[PDB]
Amino acid sequence: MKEIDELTIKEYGVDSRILMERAGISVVLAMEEELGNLSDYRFLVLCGGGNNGGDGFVVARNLLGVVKDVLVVFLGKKKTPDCEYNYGLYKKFGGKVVEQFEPSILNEFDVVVDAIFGTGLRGEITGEYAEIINLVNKSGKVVVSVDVPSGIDSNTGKVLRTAVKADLTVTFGVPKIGHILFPGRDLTGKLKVANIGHPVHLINSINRYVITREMVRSLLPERPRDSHKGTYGKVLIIAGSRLYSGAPVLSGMGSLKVGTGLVKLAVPFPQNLIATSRFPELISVPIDTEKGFFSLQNLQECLELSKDVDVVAIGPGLGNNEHVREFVNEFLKTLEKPAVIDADAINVLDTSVLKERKSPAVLTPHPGEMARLVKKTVGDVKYNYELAEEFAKENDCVLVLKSATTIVTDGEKTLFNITGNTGLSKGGSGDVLTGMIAGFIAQGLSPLEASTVSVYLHGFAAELFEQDERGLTASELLRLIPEAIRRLK
Amino acid sequence: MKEIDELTIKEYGVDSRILMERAGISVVLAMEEELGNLSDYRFLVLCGGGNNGGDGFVVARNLLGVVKDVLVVFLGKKKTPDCEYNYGLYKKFGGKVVEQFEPSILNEFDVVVDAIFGTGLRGEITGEYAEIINLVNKSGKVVVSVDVPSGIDSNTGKVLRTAVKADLTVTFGVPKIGHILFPGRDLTGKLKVANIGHPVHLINSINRYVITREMVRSLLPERPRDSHKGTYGKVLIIAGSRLYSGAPVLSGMGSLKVGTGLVKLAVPFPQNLIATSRFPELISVPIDTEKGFFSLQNLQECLELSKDVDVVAIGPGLGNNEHVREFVNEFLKTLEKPAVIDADAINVLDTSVLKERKSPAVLTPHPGEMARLVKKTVGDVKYNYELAEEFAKENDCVLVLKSATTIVTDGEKTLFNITGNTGLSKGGSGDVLTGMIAGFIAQGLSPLEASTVSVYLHGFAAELFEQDERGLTASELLRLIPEAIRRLK
Amino acid sequence: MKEIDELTIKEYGVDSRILMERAGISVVLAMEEELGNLSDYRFLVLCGGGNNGGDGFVVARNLLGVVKDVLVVFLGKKKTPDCEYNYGLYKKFGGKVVEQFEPSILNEFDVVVDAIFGTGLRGEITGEYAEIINLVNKSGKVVVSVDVPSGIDSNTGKVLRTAVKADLTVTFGVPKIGHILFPGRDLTGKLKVANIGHPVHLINSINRYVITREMVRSLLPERPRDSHKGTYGKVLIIAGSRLYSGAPVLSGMGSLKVGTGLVKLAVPFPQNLIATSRFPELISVPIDTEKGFFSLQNLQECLELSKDVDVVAIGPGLGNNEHVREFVNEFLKTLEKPAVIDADAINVLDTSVLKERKSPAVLTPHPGEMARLVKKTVGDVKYNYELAEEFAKENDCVLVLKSATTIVTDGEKTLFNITGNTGLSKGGSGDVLTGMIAGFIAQGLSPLEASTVSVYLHGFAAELFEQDERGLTASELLRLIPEAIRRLK
Amino acid sequence: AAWLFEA
Amino acid sequence: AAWLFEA
Amino acid sequence: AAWLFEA
Amino acid sequence: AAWLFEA
Ligand SMILES: NC(=O)C1=CN([C@@H]2O[C@H](COP(=O)(O)OP(=O)(O)OC[C@H]3O[C@@H](n4cnc5c(N)ncnc54)[C@H](O)[C@@H]3O)[C@@H](O)[C@H]2O)[C@@H](O)CC1
Ligand SMILES: NC(=O)C1=CN([C@@H]2O[C@H](COP(=O)(O)OP(=O)(O)OC[C@H]3O[C@@H](n4cnc5c(N)ncnc54)[C@H](O)[C@@H]3O)[C@@H](O)[C@H]2O)[C@@H](O)CC1
Ligand SMILES: NC(=O)C1=CN([C@@H]2O[C@H](COP(=O)(O)OP(=O)(O)OC[C@H]3O[C@@H](n4cnc5c(N)ncnc54)[C@H](O)[C@@H]3O)[C@@H](O)[C@H]2O)[C@@H](O)CC1
Ligand SMILES: Nc1ncnc2c1ncn2[C@@H]1O[C@H](COP(=O)(O)OP(=O)(O)O)[C@@H](O)[C@H]1O
Ligand SMILES: Nc1ncnc2c1ncn2[C@@H]1O[C@H](COP(=O)(O)OP(=O)(O)O)[C@@H](O)[C@H]1O
Ligand SMILES: Nc1ncnc2c1ncn2[C@@H]1O[C@H](COP(=O)(O)OP(=O)(O)O)[C@@H](O)[C@H]1O
Ligand SMILES: [K+]
Ligand SMILES: [K+]
Ligand SMILES: [K+]
Ligand SMILES: [Mg+2]
Ligand SMILES: [Mg+2]
Ligand SMILES: [Mg+2]
Q: Which of B192, B196, B198 to mutate to test the interface with D (most CBs of D within 10 A)?
A: B192
How is chain C split into domains, by residue range? 1-206, 207-489
Phi/psi-derived region of residue C380, left when phi > 0, alpha when psi is between -120 and 50, beta in every other case: alpha
Q: Which positions ≥6 away from B450 have C-beta within 8 Å?
A: B362, B437, B438, B439, B440, B441
Choose, out of A422, A431, A476, the residue to mutate when testing the contact with B (most B CBs < 10 Å): A422
Q: Is A349 touching ligand 1 by the criterion CB < 6 Å?
A: no
What resolution does the deposited structure have, in angstroms?
2.3
Would you call E5 and C191 a contact, using CB atoms and an 8 Å cutoff? no
- E strands of B90-226, at which residues? 97-98, 111-115, 142-146, 168-172, 190-194, 208-210
| Chain B residue at shortest CA distance from G1 | B37
CA of A356 to the centre of ligand 4 (A): 30
Q: Is B147 annotated as a binding residue?
A: yes
Query: What is the C-alpha separation between C41 and C69, in angstroms, rounded?
Result: 7
Nearest listed ligand to the Cα of residue A171:
7
Closest CA to B402 of B375, B420, B386: B420
What is the DSSP secondary structure assignment for residue C40, as one 8-state letter?
G
First-to-last CA distance in chain F?
11
| Cα–Cα distance list, A60 to A73, A233, B38, B79 (Å) | 11, 59, 60, 75
Q: With beta carbons less than 8 A apart as the criterion, state whether B49 and B83 touch.
A: yes
Q: Which residues of A touch C23 (CB under 8 A)?
A: none
How far, in Å, is the centroid of ligand 1 from the Cα of B449? 28
B335 belongs to an annotated ligand binding site: no
Q: Which element (helix H / strand E) includes A162?
A: none
Check CB contact under 8 Å for C21 and A22: yes
Closest ligand 3 atom, residue C344 Cα? 39
Among candidates B465, B353, B362, which has minimal Cα distance to B406? B362
Peptide bond into A316 cis (omega under 30): no
Which conformational region is residue C428 in: left (phi greater than 0), alpha (psi within -120 to 50 degrees), or beta? left
B451's CB contacts (< 8 A; 6+ apart) are B362, B364, B398, B400, B408, B437
The DSSP element (H or E) to which A98 belongs, if any, is strand A97-98
Cβ within 8 Å, pair C66-F1: no
Are C26 and C172 contacting, i.e. CB atoms less than 8 angstroms apart? yes
- Angle, nearest 10°, between helix axes A429-442 and A474-488? 40
Identify whether the C-beta of residue A442 lies closer than 8 Å to the C-beta of residue A261. Answer: yes
CB atoms A404 and B227 under 8 Å: yes
Q: How many whole angstroms separate alpha carbon A239 and alpha carbon A314? A: 6
| Beta pairing partners, B170 | B146, B192
First to last CA, chain E: 11
Rounded CA-CA distance B70/B79 in Å is 20
| Number of Cβ atoms within 10 Å of the Cβ of A344 | 26
Q: What is the least distance, in Å, from the CA of A12 to any CA of chain C?
A: 6
- Kindly determine whether residue G3 and residue B36, on different chains, have CB atoms separated by under 8 Å: no
Nearest to C30 by CA among C253, C240, C215, C193: C193
Inter-chain CB proximity E1 and A66 less than 8 Å: no
> CB-side exposure of C250: number of CA atoms within 13 Å?
22
Q: Which of C219, C256, C208, C250 is nearest to C235 (CA)?
A: C256
Of residues C256, C291, C271, C300, the one with CA closest to residue C439:
C256
Q: Is residue A141 classed exposed, middle or buried when 0-12, 13-18 and 19+ CB atoms within 10 A define those classes?
A: middle
Q: C89, A25: Cβ pair inside 8 Å?
A: no
DSSP secondary structure of C109-137? -SEEEEES-STT--S---HHHHHHHHHHH
CA distance C157 to C179: 6
Spatial distance between the Cα atoms of B93 and C7, rounded to a whole number of angstroms: 83
Q: Which of B29, B33, B193 sits opposite D6 (nearest CB)?
A: B193
Partners of F4 on chain A (C-beta within 8 Å) are: 26, 29, 194-195
Distance in angstroms (rounded) separating the CA atoms of residues B22 and A223? 74
Decide if C285 contacts C312 (C-beta within 8 A). no
Identify the CATH number of the domain defined by range A207-489. 3.40.1190.20
For C311: left if phi > 0, alpha if psi spans -120 to 50, otherwise beta; the answer is: beta
Task: Please name the chains neighbouring F, where neighbouring means 3+ C-beta pairs under 8 angstroms.
Answer: A, C
For chain D, the residues whose C-beta falls within 8 A of a C-beta of chain B are: 3-7
Angle, vertex CA C12, rays to CA C9 and CA C13, nearest 5: 55
Q: B212-216: which pairs have CB atoms within 8 A and are 24 or more residues apart?
A: B213/B456, B213/B488, B215/B452, B216/B452, B216/B453, B216/B456, B216/B457, B216/B488
C405 is annotated as contributing to ligand binding = yes
Dist CA A109 CA A41 (whole Å) = 7
From CA B226, how far away is CA A187, in angstroms rounded?
12
Chains that touch A (3 or more CB pairs under 8 A): B, C, E, F
Q: Which ligand is nearest to the CA of B407?
A: 5
What count of CB pairs under 8 Å joins B to G?
12
Q: What are phi and psi of B414, to 5 degrees?
A: -125, 130
- A300 C-alpha vs ligand 4 centroid, how far in Å? 33
Breaks in chain D at C–N > 2.5 Å: after which residues? Answer: none
| Interchain touch G–A (≥3 Cβ pairs closer than 8 Å) | no
Residues with CB under 6 A from ligand 2: B 244, 246-247, 316-318, 343-344, 347, 366-369, 378, 403, 427-428, 430-431
Q: Which of C188, C345, C211, C193 is nearest to C266 (CA)?
A: C345
Would you call A123 helix, strand, or coil by DSSP? coil
Q: Alpha carbon of A184 to those of A172, C317, C459: distances in Å?
A: 16, 78, 56
Nearest CA in chain D to B30: D5
Q: Which ligand is nearest to the CA of C246?
A: 3
Q: Which residues of F touch C (CB under 8 A)?
A: 1-4
Q: How many CB atoms lie within 10 A of CB C405?
A: 22
Which chains have at least 3 CB atom pairs separated by less than 8 Å from chain B?
A: A, D, G
* B425, B456, B468: residue to mutate for ligand 5 pocket, most atoms within 8 A of CB: B425
Coil vs helix vs strand at C365: coil
The helix or strand, by DSSP H or E, that contains position C464, with its residue range, turns out to be: none
Write the residue in C15, C92, C200 that is nearest to A12 by C-beta.
C92
Our CA angle for B7, B11, B14, nearest 5°, is: 80
Beta strands in C147-248, from DSSP E residues, in sequence order: 168-172, 190-194, 208-210, 234-238
Segment holding A150, helix H or strand E: none
Distance of alpha carbon A354 from alpha carbon A245, whole angstroms: 28
Confirm whether residue B402 is marked as ligand binding.
Answer: yes
- Cα separation, A75 vs A96, in Å, equals 14
DSSP assignment of C249-293: HHHHHHHHHTT-SEEEEEEETTTHHHHHHH-TTSEEEEE--SSSS
For residues A444 and A442, what is the distance between their CA atoms, to the nearest angstrom?
5
In the complex, which subunits touch D with 3 or more CB pairs below 8 angstroms? B
CA distance B347 to B378: 14
Please indicate if the annotation marks C446 as binding a ligand: no
Query: How many CA atoms within 13 Å lie on the side-chain side of B83?
Result: 20
Experimental method: X-ray
Return the SS3 of B474: helix
What are the residues whose beta carbons fall under 8 Å from the beta carbon of A379, sequence distance 6 or more? none
Q: Is A141 helix (H, G, I), strand (E, B) or coil?
A: coil
CB contact under 8 A, A29 and E2: no
Spatial distance between the Cα atoms of B457 and B483, rounded to a whole number of angstroms: 10
Other CB atoms within a 10 A radius of the CB of residue C155 amount to 16
Q: Which residues of C82-97 are buried (b: 16+ CB within 10 A; e: fewer)?
A: bbebbbebbeebebeb
Q: What is d(CA B238, CA B43) in angstroms, rounded to the nearest whole number?
A: 60
| Whether C12 and A201 lie within 8 Å, measured CB to CB | no
Which residues are placed with Cβ below 5 angstroms of ligand 8, an ion? B 114, 118, 145-146, 150
Residues of E in contact with A37 (CB under 8 A): 1-2
Q: Is B262 among the annotated ligand-binding positions? A: no
Q: CA–CA separation, B450 vs B454, rounded Å?
A: 6
Superfamily of domain C1-206: YjeF N-terminal domain (3.40.50.10260)
- Is residue B62 a known part of a binding site? no
- Give residue C343 CA to ligand 12 midpoint distance, Å: 5
The CA distance from B447 to B441, in Å, is 6
Instruction: Please tell me if the CB atom of residue A403 comes closer than 6 angstroms to any atom of ligand 1.
Output: yes
Contacts of residue B219, Cβ cutoff 8 Å, sequence gap at least 6: B445, B449, B452, B453
